[PDB]
Design a protein around this ligand. Structure first.
Ligand SMILES: Cc1c2c(n3c1CCCNC[C@H](C)Nc1cc-3ccc1C(N)=O)CC(C)(C)CC2=O
Length: 207
C-alpha cells in the first residue's frame, strides 16, 4: 500500500466540495456516468484500429449497483480503464488546470454543478461519499485500487479482488445522511434527468 499527497490544487478542490453548502448533490451521478462514457468512447475508438484490445471483453456498458448493507453505490464500466501512472500522476496533473479554472469560475458566480465543464467532475463524488474507492484495469497494466477519504492523501495498491477484465469500478462509500442514493426510485429519477442520452446501456441493479 502506497500513500501519496494530492496536488495542492486538488486538495483545495476536495475541501471546497466537502465544506461548501450546496444542496444540489445529485449531480455527482451524472459526472461519474460521464467519466464512464468517456472511457467507453476511448476503448471503442482504439478497438477500431486494434480489435484485439477487446480480448479483455467485448461488452461496452455501465452498471449502477446499490448495496444498502455496505452503504455503497458502485458505478461499473467496461471502458478503457486506468494505468498506475494515470491513477498516481497523469490525471491529477491534468486536473490542476481544470481545478484552478473551476475555482476561479466559482469566485465569479458559477456553481458547483458546472464542475464537469472543467474536467474534474470525478471529485463531485465527495458531495455524497465519505470515501471513494476506484478499482481499475487497463489492457497495458495490472488491476489497481485507488482510495481516498480526502484529508489531503490517497492510496494506491495492487488489487487482489475479483479480476475485472477491463474497465473501472467507482465505489462510493456514502455519508450517513446521503442514503437516498441507494434507493431505486431515486437513482432512476437522476439517470432519467441528467443521463438520458448516454450512448451505452446503463443497468440499474436492484437489491
Ligand atoms: C480527473 C480525473 C480523476 C479520475 N478520473 C478523472 C477524469 C479524467 C478523464 N477520464 C479518463 C479515464 C480513462 N477514465 C476515468 C478517469 C477518472 C475517473 C473515472 C474514469 C473512468 N470511469 O474510466 C480518477 C482519479 C482516481 C485518477 C482521480 C482524478 O483526478
Amino acid at each position: 500500500v502506497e500513500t501519496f499527497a494530492f496536488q495542492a490544487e486538488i486538495a483545495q478542490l476536495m475541501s471546497l466540495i466537502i465544506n461548501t453548502f450546496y444542496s444540489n448533490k445529485e449531480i455527482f451521478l451524472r459526472e461519474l456516468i460521464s467519466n464512464s462514457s468517456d472511457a467507453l468512447d476511448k476503448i471503442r475508438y482504439e478497438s477500431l484500429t486494434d480489435p484485439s484490445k477487446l480480448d479483455s471483453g467485448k461488452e461496452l456498458h455501465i452498471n449502477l449497483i446499490p448495496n444498502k448493507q455496505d452503504r455503497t453505490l458502485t458505478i461499473v464500466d467496461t471502458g478503457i480503464g486506468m494505468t498506475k501512472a494515470d491513477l498516481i500522476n497523469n490525471l491529477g496533473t491534468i486536473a490542476k488546470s481544470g481545478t484552478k479554472a473551476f475555482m476561479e469560475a466559482l469566485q465569479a458566480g458559477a456553481d458547483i454543478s458546472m464542475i464537469g465543464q472543467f474536467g474534474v467532475g470525478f471529485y463531485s463524488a465527495y458531495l455524497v461519499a465519505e470515501k471513494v474507492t476506484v478499482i481499475t484495469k487497463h489492457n497495458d497494466d495490472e488491476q489497481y485500487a485507488w482510495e481516498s477519504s480526502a484529508g489531503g492523501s490517497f492510496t494506491v495498491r495492487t488489487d487482489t479482488g475479483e479480476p475485472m477484465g477491463r474497465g473501472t469500478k467507482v465505489i462510493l462509500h456514502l455519508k450517513e445522511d446521503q442514503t437516498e442514493y441507494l434507493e431505486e426510485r431515486r437513482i432512476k429519477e437522476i439517470v432519467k434527468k441528467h443521463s438520458q442520452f448516454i450512448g451505452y446501456p446503463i443497468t440499474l441493479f436492484v437489491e
